[PDB]
Enzyme design. Sequence first.
Site, PDB file in Angstrom:
ATOM      1  N   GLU A   1      -2.216  61.023  -8.318  1.00 27.87           N
ATOM      2  CA  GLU A   1      -2.949  61.852  -7.370  1.00 27.87           C
ATOM      3  C   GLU A   1      -3.177  63.261  -7.894  1.00 27.87           C
ATOM      4  OE1 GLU A   1       0.181  61.199  -4.578  1.00 27.87           O
ATOM      5  OE2 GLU A   1      -1.074  59.899  -3.334  1.00 27.87           O
TER       6      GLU A   1
ATOM      7  N   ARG B   1       1.462  46.941  -1.060  1.00 28.71           N
ATOM      8  CA  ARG B   1       1.194  46.505  -2.424  1.00 28.71           C
ATOM      9  C   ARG B   1       1.326  44.976  -2.531  1.00 28.71           C
ATOM     10  NH1 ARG B   1       1.362  49.535  -6.684  1.00 28.71           N
ATOM     11  NH2 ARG B   1       2.489  51.202  -5.572  1.00 28.71           N
TER      12      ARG B   1
ATOM     13  N   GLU C   1      -6.015  54.219   1.414  1.00 24.02           N
ATOM     14  CA  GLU C   1      -4.854  53.405   1.059  1.00 24.02           C
ATOM     15  C   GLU C   1      -3.790  53.693   2.107  1.00 24.02           C
ATOM     16  OE1 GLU C   1      -3.498  54.866  -2.773  1.00 24.02           O
ATOM     17  OE2 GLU C   1      -4.991  53.699  -3.858  1.00 24.02           O
ATOM     18  N   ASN C   2      -2.781  52.832   2.175  1.00 18.65           N
ATOM     19  CA  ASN C   2      -1.665  53.042   3.088  1.00 18.65           C
ATOM     20  C   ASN C   2      -0.607  53.694   2.204  1.00 18.65           C
ATOM     21  OD1 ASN C   2      -1.681  50.300   1.796  1.00 18.65           O
ATOM     22  ND2 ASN C   2       0.448  50.305   2.515  1.00 18.65           N
TER      23      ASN C   2
HETATM   24  O1  LIG Z   1      -0.226  51.677  -7.898  1.00 17.62           O
HETATM   25  C1  LIG Z   1      -0.812  52.941  -7.622  1.00 17.62           C
HETATM   26  C2  LIG Z   1       0.236  54.036  -7.517  1.00 17.62           C
HETATM   27  O2  LIG Z   1       1.273  53.577  -6.622  1.00 17.62           O
HETATM   28  C3  LIG Z   1       2.272  54.561  -6.346  1.00 17.62           C
HETATM   29  O3  LIG Z   1       1.709  55.728  -5.867  1.00 17.62           O
HETATM   30  C4  LIG Z   1       1.240  55.705  -4.517  1.00 17.62           C
HETATM   31  C5  LIG Z   1       2.406  56.033  -3.562  1.00 17.62           C
HETATM   32  O4  LIG Z   1       3.406  55.023  -3.632  1.00 17.62           O
HETATM   33  C6  LIG Z   1       1.887  56.145  -2.130  1.00 17.62           C
HETATM   34  O5  LIG Z   1       2.934  56.609  -1.287  1.00 17.62           O
HETATM   35  C7  LIG Z   1       0.727  57.141  -2.068  1.00 17.62           C
HETATM   36  O6  LIG Z   1       0.195  57.151  -0.791  1.00 17.62           O
HETATM   37  O7  LIG Z   1       0.706  58.869  -1.885  1.00 17.62           O
HETATM   38  C8  LIG Z   1       1.227  60.026  -1.242  1.00 17.62           C
HETATM   39  C9  LIG Z   1       1.201  59.794   0.264  1.00 17.62           C
HETATM   40  O8  LIG Z   1      -0.152  59.777   0.698  1.00 17.62           O
HETATM   41  C10 LIG Z   1       1.945  60.907   1.003  1.00 17.62           C
HETATM   42  O9  LIG Z   1       2.001  60.602   2.390  1.00 17.62           O
HETATM   43  C11 LIG Z   1       3.364  61.078   0.442  1.00 17.62           C
HETATM   44  O10 LIG Z   1       4.151  59.972   0.822  1.00 17.62           O
HETATM   45  C12 LIG Z   1       5.188  60.295   1.771  1.00 17.62           C
HETATM   46  C13 LIG Z   1       5.064  59.474   3.062  1.00 17.62           C
HETATM   47  O11 LIG Z   1       3.801  59.704   3.675  1.00 17.62           O
HETATM   48  C14 LIG Z   1       6.184  59.917   4.016  1.00 17.62           C
HETATM   49  O12 LIG Z   1       6.141  59.157   5.218  1.00 17.62           O
HETATM   50  C15 LIG Z   1       7.549  59.757   3.333  1.00 17.62           C
HETATM   51  O13 LIG Z   1       7.772  58.422   3.033  1.00 17.62           O
HETATM   52  O14 LIG Z   1       7.571  60.483   2.097  1.00 17.62           O
HETATM   53  C16 LIG Z   1       6.559  60.021   1.172  1.00 17.62           C
HETATM   54  C17 LIG Z   1       6.793  60.713  -0.157  1.00 17.62           C
HETATM   55  O15 LIG Z   1       7.404  61.974   0.038  1.00 17.62           O
HETATM   56  O16 LIG Z   1       3.344  61.290  -0.976  1.00 17.62           O
HETATM   57  C18 LIG Z   1       2.645  60.294  -1.778  1.00 17.62           C
HETATM   58  C19 LIG Z   1       2.555  60.869  -3.186  1.00 17.62           C
HETATM   59  O17 LIG Z   1       3.404  60.176  -4.096  1.00 17.62           O
HETATM   60  O18 LIG Z   1      -0.320  56.790  -2.993  1.00 17.62           O
HETATM   61  C20 LIG Z   1       0.139  56.764  -4.360  1.00 17.62           C
HETATM   62  C21 LIG Z   1      -1.074  56.519  -5.243  1.00 17.62           C
HETATM   63  O19 LIG Z   1      -1.543  55.177  -5.137  1.00 17.62           O
HETATM   64  C22 LIG Z   1       3.001  54.963  -7.614  1.00 17.62           C
HETATM   65  O20 LIG Z   1       3.904  56.019  -7.278  1.00 17.62           O
HETATM   66  C23 LIG Z   1       1.964  55.491  -8.610  1.00 17.62           C
HETATM   67  O21 LIG Z   1       2.599  55.841  -9.827  1.00 17.62           O
HETATM   68  C24 LIG Z   1       0.860  54.450  -8.856  1.00 17.62           C
HETATM   69  O22 LIG Z   1      -0.140  55.013  -9.690  1.00 17.62           O
END
Ligand SMILES: OC[C@H]1O[C@H](O[C@H]2[C@H](O)[C@@H](O)[C@@](O)(O[C@H]3[C@H](O)[C@@H](O)[C@@H](O[C@H]4[C@H](O)[C@@H](O)[C@@H](O)O[C@@H]4CO)O[C@@H]3CO)O[C@@H]2CO)[C@H](O)[C@@H](O)[C@@H]1O
Length: 516
Positions: A172, A397, A367-368
């Site tokens: 991201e 996933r 995405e979720n």
């Molecule tokens: O396969 C593609 C990639 O998969 C992984 O990255 C994902 C990640 O697993 C997923 O969580 C996400 O959504 O991104 C943000 C997210 O949008 C934010 O909300 C936050 O997540 C937080 C939760 O929302 C919150 O409820 C609590 O659980 O804390 C969470 C983290 O602090 O932060 C994440 C950023 O990491 O999308 C990504 C991208 O697909 C994998 O890590 C990555 O390497 C892969 O490329």
Amino acid sequence: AVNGKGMNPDYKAYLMAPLKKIPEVTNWETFENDLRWAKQNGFYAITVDFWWGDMEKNGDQQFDFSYAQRFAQSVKNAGMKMIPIISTHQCGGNVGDDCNVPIPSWVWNQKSDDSLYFKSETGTVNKETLNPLASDVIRKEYGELYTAFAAAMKPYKDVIAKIYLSGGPAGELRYPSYTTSDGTGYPSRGKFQAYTEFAKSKFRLWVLNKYGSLNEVNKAWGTKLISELAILPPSDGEQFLMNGYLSMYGKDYLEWYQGILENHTKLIGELAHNAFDTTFQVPIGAKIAGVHWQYNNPTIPHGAEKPAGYNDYSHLLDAFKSAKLDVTFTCLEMTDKGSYPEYSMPKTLVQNIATLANEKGIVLNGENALSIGNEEEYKRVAEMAFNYNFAGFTLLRYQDVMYNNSLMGKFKDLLGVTPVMQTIVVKNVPTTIGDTVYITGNRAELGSWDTKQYPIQLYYDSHSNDWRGNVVLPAERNIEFKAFIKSKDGTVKSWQTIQQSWNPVPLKTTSHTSSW
Ligand SMILES: OC[C@H]1O[C@H](O[C@H]2[C@H](O)[C@@H](O)[C@@](O)(O[C@H]3[C@H](O)[C@@H](O)[C@@H](O[C@H]4[C@H](O)[C@@H](O)[C@@H](O)O[C@@H]4CO)O[C@@H]3CO)O[C@@H]2CO)[C@H](O)[C@@H](O)[C@@H]1O
Ligand SMILES: OC[C@H]1O[C@H](O[C@H]2[C@H](O)[C@@H](O)[C@H](O)O[C@@H]2CO)[C@H](O)[C@@H](O)[C@@H]1O
Ligand SMILES: OC[C@H]1O[C@H](O[C@H]2[C@H](O)[C@@H](O)[C@H](O)O[C@@H]2CO)[C@H](O)[C@@H](O)[C@@H]1O
Ligand SMILES: [Ca+2]
């Protein structure tokens, strides 16, 4: 959907592949059967992380795209499509990560200074991805990787539907402001990541370029800095987030801080289009994180987003438009809370982002954020995807639905749908001057009975004296709906007598006619 619209006709459902290589989870033959199963459930393609750490491990220009080619081969065998992610970030350390693939260890030896990595307010070093300030290194390395990847994958062009780029941690575009080592993991405030000597120097030079001299800097900020060396990022992150951000200094610091990500976006977009447009000629995209915590914290407004690099989403998205990159927002399955101590407003966040994207004409995908274990989360995703014009949704996933027939079925029903144009005709509508007509229905694609913001508008046909609308609906899904009337003031005047239905929506475009 919002604005009297309906679901996006280009909507596609995607499935995230596992983080680890396929052979570490199952075998290639079974994987091919899984892909066929996925397609049967409405998935158009599988997105997959191809790790920089795996593709250029030993040294500069020492590539290995065999895993990627092998993966592509199986995708081809299954008659499926795939969306490669050139993951120039480390796998492991982020939420949901079940892997351990750091970026090539040699890259850190390309510089003798601290320009390549990040350093937080408290000194925590992060090396999950290259510091976007090192644009020279980025241009070279990413340029070479994208170019070599394009060549090695050219024979698989037929199965590549889109290509994703990694703009930072977890794939991201953002700073690594929320990590366990820095004590900034959710739901705490994030820490700014501009404390390497190189970052301080870049900010200093940027400020001096903007104002020319320290004297002019002091005039613009109303400060009394004694030397140029006093020009620095926030020394007290907390105080900055509480009130410092309001000052001209704060505005300038945040402009620079976010500006780095905007320039990085333009750079990688440029490099990607150069390396892929000719060979594949497919859409290219990047991701934006949903940093929903500390959103409405009274003391530190958007206390997690700003350190992540998100101060002005409108401005951030403009960079995506300029770079010709589609945007994917990664957090659609959650609800607003806005309560202490998390001050989480994910739904509001997504709506604002989607609105800006739609206004700017930027293809928006979602995405979720976390694995989904219940149908309710799917309905929440559907509400957002089908009412805010999302062109696609990617489920994180693979395993969650591949090994849960029940959940897989819920997904197919609610999200694995094929959009189809259909004409809705309602006759004998008792409208008066100023009235407008709309329909609303049970499914998210129909606004889920909402008449205030998600109804789909119909239009009077003076030739037939009835009201019609060409609506995009989920093919082969049962629906219930009713037309209703809104007065000039926007007030709902009345509803259609009998509830209509289509059991199910035909696969082929046709029409549904009923009387008021
Ligand atoms: O396969 C593609 C990639 O998969 C992984 O990255 C994902 C990640 O697993 C997923 O969580 C996400 O959504 O991104 C943000 C997210 O949008 C934010 O909300 C936050 O997540 C937080 C939760 O929302 C919150 O409820 C609590 O659980 O804390 C969470 C983290 O602090 O932060 C994440 C950023 O990491 O999308 C990504 C991208 O697909 C994998 O890590 C990555 O390497 C892969 O490329
Ligand atoms: O670069 C100048 C100074 O910037 C910071 O100080 C900011 C502070 O971060 C902010 O919250 C407040 O509102 O304004 C001051 C500047 O007046 C650094 O903390 C200082 O070390 C720098 O000298
Ligand atoms: O609000 C959810 C329900 O909306 C509709 O119900 C309407 C009905 O269509 C209309 O004739 C009447 O005047 O008002 C009700 C309530 O707004 C759907 O018909 C229902 O199925 C939904 O549950
Ligand atoms: Ca290289």
